[PDB]
Every structure is written in structure tokens, then in C-alpha cells.
Design a binder for these strands. Structure first.
Ligand SMILES: [Mg+2]
Ligand SMILES: [Mg+2]
Ligand SMILES: [Mg+2]
Ligand SMILES: [Mg+2]
Ligand SMILES: [Mg+2]
Ligand SMILES: [Mg+2]
Ligand SMILES: [Mg+2]
Ligand SMILES: [Mg+2]
Ligand SMILES: [Mg+2]
Ligand SMILES: [Mg+2]
Ligand SMILES: [Mg+2]
Ligand SMILES: [Mg+2]
Ligand SMILES: [Mg+2]
Ligand SMILES: [Mg+2]
Ligand SMILES: [Mg+2]
Ligand SMILES: [Mg+2]
Ligand SMILES: [Mg+2]
Ligand SMILES: [Mg+2]
Ligand SMILES: [Mg+2]
Ligand SMILES: [Mg+2]
Ligand SMILES: [Mg+2]
Ligand SMILES: [Mg+2]
Ligand SMILES: [Mg+2]
Ligand SMILES: [Mg+2]
Ligand SMILES: [Mg+2]
Ligand SMILES: [Mg+2]
Ligand SMILES: [Mg+2]
Ligand SMILES: [Mg+2]
Ligand SMILES: [Mg+2]
Ligand SMILES: [Mg+2]
Ligand SMILES: [Mg+2]
Ligand SMILES: [Mg+2]
Ligand SMILES: [Mg+2]
Ligand SMILES: [Mg+2]
Ligand SMILES: [Mg+2]
Ligand SMILES: [Mg+2]
Ligand SMILES: [Mg+2]
Ligand SMILES: [Mg+2]
Ligand SMILES: [Mg+2]
Ligand SMILES: [Mg+2]
Ligand SMILES: [Mg+2]
Ligand SMILES: [Mg+2]
Ligand SMILES: [Mg+2]
Ligand SMILES: [Mg+2]
Ligand SMILES: [Mg+2]
Ligand SMILES: [Mg+2]
Ligand SMILES: [Mg+2]
Ligand SMILES: [Mg+2]
Ligand SMILES: [Mg+2]
Ligand SMILES: [Mg+2]
Ligand SMILES: [Mg+2]
Ligand SMILES: [Mg+2]
Ligand SMILES: [Mg+2]
Ligand SMILES: [Mg+2]
Ligand SMILES: [Mg+2]
Ligand SMILES: [Mg+2]
Ligand SMILES: [Mg+2]
Ligand SMILES: [Mg+2]
Ligand SMILES: [Mg+2]
Ligand SMILES: [Mg+2]
Ligand SMILES: [Mg+2]
Ligand SMILES: [Mg+2]
Ligand SMILES: [Mg+2]
Ligand SMILES: [Mg+2]
Ligand SMILES: [Mg+2]
Ligand SMILES: [Mg+2]
Ligand SMILES: [Mg+2]
Ligand SMILES: [Mg+2]
Ligand SMILES: [Mg+2]
Ligand SMILES: [Mg+2]
Ligand SMILES: [Mg+2]
Ligand SMILES: [Mg+2]
Ligand SMILES: [Mg+2]
Ligand SMILES: [Mg+2]
Ligand SMILES: [Mg+2]
Ligand SMILES: [Mg+2]
Ligand SMILES: [Mg+2]
Length: 56
RNA sequence: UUUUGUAUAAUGGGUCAGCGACUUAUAUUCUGUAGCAAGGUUAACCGAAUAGGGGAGCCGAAGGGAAACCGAGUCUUAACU
RNA sequence: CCGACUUACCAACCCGAUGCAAACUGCGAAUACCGGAGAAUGUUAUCACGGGAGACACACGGCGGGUGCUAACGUCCGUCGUGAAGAGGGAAACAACCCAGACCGCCAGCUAAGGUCCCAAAGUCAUGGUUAAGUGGGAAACGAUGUGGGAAGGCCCAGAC
RNA sequence: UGUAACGGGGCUAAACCAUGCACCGAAGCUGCGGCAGCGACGCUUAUGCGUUGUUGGGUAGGGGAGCGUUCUGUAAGCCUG
RNA sequence: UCCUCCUAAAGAGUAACGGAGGAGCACGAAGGUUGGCUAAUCCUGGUCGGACAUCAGGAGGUUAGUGCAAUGGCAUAAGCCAGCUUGACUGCGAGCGUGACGGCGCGAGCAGGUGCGAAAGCAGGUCAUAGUGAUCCGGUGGUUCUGAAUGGAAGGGCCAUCGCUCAACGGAUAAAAGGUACUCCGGGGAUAACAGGCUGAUACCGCCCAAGAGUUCAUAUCGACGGCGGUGUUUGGCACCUCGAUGUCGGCUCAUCACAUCCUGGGGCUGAAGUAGGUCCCAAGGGUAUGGCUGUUCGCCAUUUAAAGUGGUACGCGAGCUG
RNA sequence: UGCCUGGCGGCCGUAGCGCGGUGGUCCCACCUGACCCCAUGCCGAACUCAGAAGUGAAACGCCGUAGCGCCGAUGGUAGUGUGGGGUCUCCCCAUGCGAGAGUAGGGAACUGCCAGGCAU
């Protein structure tokens, strides 16, 4: 279980960068989401690391 | 208004008041609603007459094949699992 | 005839070394594309049918290219973003650049881009060096004892310069 | 055409390359109140009585719900010197 | 109109008046099967015989060949020869690929009847990708499907098939050229010329090395073979503003700004003895001609001037004039 | 159980070339002859038949040799997906992927089944 938050917009981003946020459940700026720790979530975090921040 | 793009030095209007631009008939398809239901429904017309009669007639319940023709099967081909 | 020779010259095949090619690959990625399984999330976001449209004049920016002068806010193709159809802050002004997607109201607070001397809201903030040209605040080949450094080298107290 | 290649004043830093701590800075995010749609759930529906999550920029265009005027029936009713 | 490669950004596809080439056929064998075989080139030797015909070996290993243009493939050969034959058959077709669609292509396998091979097996056209044209209309053959009172038939219908460089090749008609400055309408700055805008291939100007010319000596003064920049001044590229009008070349009057200055002013070098000169730097305060020719700016000539500038202002200025 | 040989395979160069030796009990190859089965665009050269006198010369199988071919590291370089930048017809930073060429080096194949001859 890890905590993720979004800190940047998804306006000029790629479709694969917005679908990643859709999969992570992020809705807007500063949306705190709890997600299970798994290689899939880690890969998503690596993919959108420039706009997300983890609390661990 | 037209444009990728108008404060544009692209067009329109001096202002006010009145008038002014997806309507009508018939025919077909679709949606909702209402009656009836494997049936539904009349037109012309008669009728003192929005009643009633008139089911002539139209759609659908059975389709296949060009057509004869056959039939919940048919055509295709001498014959097709 | 046959030829004996060298000779201000050029040069085939092969060998050794150095390169080039969108229409050359004995080599060969990253990305992208097809399919399967799996956890999580997304208002089925997917497909099929039926009713109704609108549109087929796009532009700019990034990356990958052709034609141009490796010129054009030039033109032609692929991908993404924006405008078109998107308000707001910033770049002094600015359709396409950056941040960021306006349900409404509040004389509440927190931030991103971008800034904190005044216009104009915020540090005349602290330590550390550079610049003396208003460089900052438009530009090249090239030239110069301009300085701020780093690493070496020659000559040199029998005397260098 | 008139400074006119920092926006201007002005700056020997208020310029640049390096470190850090603060602040300003948007319709971005958080706080309060209010409206509407979709979907889950028990409302045994009153089709709404609480929840909860989410969404609500918008041209052409599509869908849905509505306001206003004339006349007609309700209406020999009602208001009105 | 159709075929091959690249551009085409390693799935497919993907444009330009982009770069390179082809097709509008041919074959009863150049098809199928069975059986067998492997060259291009070079070297050596040998009669006519030569660099190269034919014959022997050796090296080489597809560097040849594909009926054709290119690409992808071909040794089990798809290449090269011989024999036998017509599967260059009929009716079907699981399941796919590609297209907006019409449509096109690959196809295991089924029923009948064949060819080759002893047989297993192969053959529903050529190694593959171009060799092509919707519909209507009309013709031919066959067809027991129809046959307008009945029996026939004409005609029509199903199958095979024929006729179109419809080449503008998804084809508007069975058949079709030009002028308008006598002109006209709806429209476009979606699209033309002057002008304005972006860039600067061209134009002008500036700068760098120095081979040299310069009686010796590169740089008093010029400057090759080459290179780097500036103005947006010419001829030009794009077509972003304007076609429900921004009036255009030249001339007259009227000027203004700039300096890469024609004179005046000051200076450096000089292959500057002096006058008179050449080159370069600063400097825009002022001035900067009259006539013949031509509509002309430009330009030629005559004669002056201390000098008779370069360019911008919508190639300045027509709600100032001229035509 | 070993050695050698033949056939059918697996993989397709660390598997292939070249140099030097070895092998004939058996197998294999070379080899003898041909009216016949059969054939040569002529020819027992090839195919095929009847045989084993002779030979391991050639081919073939085996052995060792690095004159070639071949494989091939680690590290580094180019390139590149995503996000930021600069002096932007070209590069840099952060995080992942990571070549090719070349060097050191490896390397004279391995193996399955069915058969034949000699030892056991
Ligand atoms: Mg956990
Ligand atoms: Mg326009
Ligand atoms: Mg504006
Ligand atoms: Mg317009
Ligand atoms: Mg206007
Ligand atoms: Mg107009
Ligand atoms: Mg007007
Ligand atoms: Mg109805
Ligand atoms: Mg019927
Ligand atoms: Mg059936
Ligand atoms: Mg290439
Ligand atoms: Mg997938
Ligand atoms: Mg069109
Ligand atoms: Mg178009
Ligand atoms: Mg376009
Ligand atoms: Mg454009
Ligand atoms: Mg580009
Ligand atoms: Mg351009
Ligand atoms: Mg602009
Ligand atoms: Mg254009
Ligand atoms: Mg539009
Ligand atoms: Mg905006
Ligand atoms: Mg948007
Ligand atoms: Mg703004
Ligand atoms: Mg600006
Ligand atoms: Mg502003
Ligand atoms: Mg704050
Ligand atoms: Mg900040
Ligand atoms: Mg202040
Ligand atoms: Mg201070
Ligand atoms: Mg001035
Ligand atoms: Mg605010
Ligand atoms: Mg908000
Ligand atoms: Mg609230
Ligand atoms: Mg809305
Ligand atoms: Mg919103
Ligand atoms: Mg009434
Ligand atoms: Mg491709
Ligand atoms: Mg691709
Ligand atoms: Mg053939
Ligand atoms: Mg054969
Ligand atoms: Mg000869
Ligand atoms: Mg060829
Ligand atoms: Mg053949
Ligand atoms: Mg059969
Ligand atoms: Mg037979
Ligand atoms: Mg062919
Ligand atoms: Mg016709
Ligand atoms: Mg008759
Ligand atoms: Mg009959
Ligand atoms: Mg015809
Ligand atoms: Mg066509
Ligand atoms: Mg007109
Ligand atoms: Mg235009
Ligand atoms: Mg023009
Ligand atoms: Mg204009
Ligand atoms: Mg000389
Ligand atoms: Mg021009
Ligand atoms: Mg005009
Ligand atoms: Mg006008
Ligand atoms: Mg005019
Ligand atoms: Mg001067
Ligand atoms: Mg002055
Ligand atoms: Mg004075
Ligand atoms: Mg005279
Ligand atoms: Mg003029
Ligand atoms: Mg004039
Ligand atoms: Mg005027
Ligand atoms: Mg005249
Ligand atoms: Mg023997
Ligand atoms: Mg023999
Ligand atoms: Mg031997
Ligand atoms: Mg490596
Ligand atoms: Mg990048
Ligand atoms: Mg390597
Ligand atoms: Mg290597
Ligand atoms: Mg060997």
C-alpha cells in the first residue's frame, strides 16, 4: 500500500500519459490515491514520474 | 458575417417605430403514446350526417428461386457432409 | 618477321590501409505494431444495429523528411499538443509559445509557469567567485600582452629576462 | 518620422554562472454557502426521503426541458366606470 | 489507367508539376507430370581460328539464368534437356487477406471425369507482383423456364460468349471547335498585376588568408583561385491585408529623414619635391545647374559650377496639378 | 562394454576451407566384362546388369597442426523511448534500452536410432 499524488496537469501530455493517470485513478491536481504496491503500479509511477509524487 | 486566423485599415448597418424569412398538401420510413390483436383497418359513397352502415380495398402472419415451381423449406448443380 | 631497351605519362586484377550512398546490406537497436496471461483503476470508457447531423478551405509549435538557398508566418507527407471550438496568469502588447481546462457566489487560504528597487504584489535575502563592456539589453568568419582560472614545459642566484 | 535591439525609470548590481531559506504570483488546488446531470445503494418507490463518489469551457451539430403572444373550448363562468 | 524501388519515420498504409524505370503483350508450348543436369568468368593446350565460335582439363562457386522493366525469391532448384499428355476440367467451397463501395486476390478440402508417375503424390495455367474497362443496348449457340382466349411462334428470362486507345481509362451524350478590347451576371483577395508583408536565391556594400601586379618589395593603389557578413534599393520566391475598388509610369509645385558623403570642414598613409592628385577615418550644418533628343525615370551631347550625391518616404506627393 | 564402418537423422561454420599422415579382416570406394533388363542428342563417361582378379593411388572416414574462414567477451562509443533545457539547419541534462565495428579470447564439432566386422 502506497500513497500517490498528482502535481502537474495532463493537458499537453500524451494519450499514454493520460491513460496512465486514468488507470492510477488520478482526477486532478493534488488527488491523493492509495494503491497496492506491485510491479505494475511501480511501472506506472516510472512512466508518469514527472507529474506524480509518492509518500513512502 | 465569412474565415487557420479580425480592434482590424475585410463586409453589413444613421437612428427609431411597424413588416420580414424551415410553412402547406400528398406519399414512404423511424420514435413515443393510445385502441385492438394473428389480426388491424377503412376510402369513395349512403346516411340530417363528427353516430351508424359500407371491409371494395391495403399491411402482416412463409419464404426460396429469373421463372415455371416447391414449400419451413427452396435455389444452386446429373449429385452434394 | 621477331623484337632488345627505358620512360617528363596513364593504368586493369589482386593485396594492405582511409572514406561515402534514399533507390548497397555478410551487422543491427531504441520506439512503434499483433497476440496471450495477470493484479489494480477508469460512470462500458468496446463492439453491433437503427434515427439525425455537421464536415472533406485548416494554421502554428516540437520531432521525423522531400522540394526550396539545410530562405520564408513558403509548400508537400507521419506523430503529438494548442487554436479552430478554450476562458485565466506569464513572455511589455501577442489566436497556435510556457503554466494551467472557467457550474455560481465569498473583501478566505495554498501553489505552477514567471518574478521579489519603483511603475507593479513580493528578498535593496545570506555565503562564494566572474564582468567594467551598460556586457546583461541583436549577430559571423577573424584579430588582440583585456582579464578570472586549470595542467604542464623551456630557461634560470656558476646570474636567467 | 523621434531616443526606439532591457517595456520605461534607472542599475557597477537591481547582470551571469553555481548553494539554500522565504515571499508574491492564476477562473490551477484547499475552506464556506448554493444549483443541476449521470451511475451504486435500502428508500417497497410516491418514482424521490437520507447517503456517497463523480461530473457540469464550448463552435457546426444531436438530444432533453422550458418562458412569452393571438385565437378556440372549458366560459351566458370570473374581474371590471 | 495499371506494375517495381526510394522518399515511407524497422507492422499496414501514407503526398507533391518528387527522384529513377516499365505495361495496353506472349505461349497448345514457354502449361502439368515423370526422369536427368548444373553455370557467368578467367587460365592452360590444340588446324584453318582471330580478344571472343567448337574441343580437353584446372581455378572459381551463382559474381549466371528467369520470355519482358524493377523488386522480392529460386540448388528439393522457380534455371537447363528428353518422354508422355491437356488440370490452360465442371459444379462447389470451410476459413481469410484487401477495399467507402462496385470489386480483387490466396485457398485446405468435397462430388464427377482425366493426365503423369511402379507408387507415395502432383496438376483448377506460366517464380510471383502490370498485359486492362462498370452499366445500358444489340448479335451467336444452347436451354422444355415464361409465352397477354388455346396450340405454336415472335419476343422476353437463365448459361456460355461476342462488339467501346469510353486513353479525360469507376467511363456525363450513339455524335461537338473557337473569339469577345461591343460585352454582361453571381462570386473570390479561397486567385491574378502595382502597392504593403516574410526571406534574401539575385542587387549593392562591408570584412578575412595572401598567388600576385606594382622596375626589387603582397598590402601607396588594385586583387585571383576561395571564404564570412550587413541593407531590405533592383530583377526575383510565398501569396499573409486589401477585387460589396488601397488609382497606377513619368512630369510640375511641395518637402522631410539617413550617411555607405559630390562640395565645403578636420585628419592618417602615399611609389605625397609644389600645384594638382590616389586611398582611408570622422563629420548631414549648409548647398547640390541650365539646355537639345525621347512620354520616358535612366541615358547621349553642348556649356557652366566650389559640387551638379546615393537611396527611403504606397518605385513620396492626382479629395495638390497634369494625361 | 569399447574400436571401426554403412544407412537414416538432430543443429546448421566453435559444425566450413587449406597442409601433413593413416585405413582395407568386414564394410566402402576404386575396379572386370557385357549378347542380354537398361542407356548415351556419339561413347558401359553417367544410368543399369552380371562379378570380386587386383588396389587404398583418387574419393571417402579418422588423427594433430591456427595459414584462413567462424564464434565471441567486459568496458567504452554512436543511437534512442519519456521529462527538461542551450549558444537550437545541431547538442546537453535526469532516468531506462543499449548497438555495430574492433581487442583479449574460444575454436581442427557434438549427438540419437537401426545395422555389419574385431576384441570382451
Ligand atoms: Mg503493502
Ligand atoms: Mg483569407
Ligand atoms: Mg485581438
Ligand atoms: Mg476574407
Ligand atoms: Mg470594419
Ligand atoms: Mg467579399
Ligand atoms: Mg456603411
Ligand atoms: Mg405508431
Ligand atoms: Mg412467395
Ligand atoms: Mg439450405
Ligand atoms: Mg539504407
Ligand atoms: Mg497488448
Ligand atoms: Mg472537396
Ligand atoms: Mg482538402
Ligand atoms: Mg494539412
Ligand atoms: Mg502554412
Ligand atoms: Mg520541419
Ligand atoms: Mg518553414
Ligand atoms: Mg506571429
Ligand atoms: Mg497556403
Ligand atoms: Mg470555422
Ligand atoms: Mg489561451
Ligand atoms: Mg483542449
Ligand atoms: Mg493570455
Ligand atoms: Mg515578445
Ligand atoms: Mg497581459
Ligand atoms: Mg503563499
Ligand atoms: Mg519556483
Ligand atoms: Mg513594491
Ligand atoms: Mg544585498
Ligand atoms: Mg535617428
Ligand atoms: Mg485567486
Ligand atoms: Mg475550480
Ligand atoms: Mg461545496
Ligand atoms: Mg456545457
Ligand atoms: Mg469544469
Ligand atoms: Mg377564449
Ligand atoms: Mg512501412
Ligand atoms: Mg511505422
Ligand atoms: Mg515457363
Ligand atoms: Mg524435377
Ligand atoms: Mg582458342
Ligand atoms: Mg530482371
Ligand atoms: Mg516448369
Ligand atoms: Mg475424385
Ligand atoms: Mg496409371
Ligand atoms: Mg513471370
Ligand atoms: Mg449509357
Ligand atoms: Mg397465346
Ligand atoms: Mg408452356
Ligand atoms: Mg459496346
Ligand atoms: Mg482512378
Ligand atoms: Mg461582375
Ligand atoms: Mg490572399
Ligand atoms: Mg507583390
Ligand atoms: Mg496593405
Ligand atoms: Mg613580386
Ligand atoms: Mg518584394
Ligand atoms: Mg483589389
Ligand atoms: Mg469598402
Ligand atoms: Mg483601379
Ligand atoms: Mg562617415
Ligand atoms: Mg543634427
Ligand atoms: Mg552650430
Ligand atoms: Mg527647337
Ligand atoms: Mg508613386
Ligand atoms: Mg502621379
Ligand atoms: Mg487619398
Ligand atoms: Mg493619351
Ligand atoms: Mg580388397
Ligand atoms: Mg562401373
Ligand atoms: Mg588416400
Ligand atoms: Mg556493452
Ligand atoms: Mg526529447
Ligand atoms: Mg559487440
Ligand atoms: Mg565483434
Ligand atoms: Mg580438418
Amino acid at each position: 500500500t502506497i500513497k500517490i499524488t498528482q502535481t502537474r496537469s495532463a493537458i499537453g501530455r500524451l494519450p499514454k500519459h493520460k491513460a496512465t493517470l486514468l488507470g492510477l485513478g488520478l482526477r486532478r491536481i493534488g488527488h491523493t490515491v492509495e494503491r497496492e504496491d506491485t510491479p505494475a503500479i511501480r511501472g506506472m509511477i516510472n512512466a508518469v514520474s514527472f507529474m506524480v509524487k509518492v509518500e513512502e
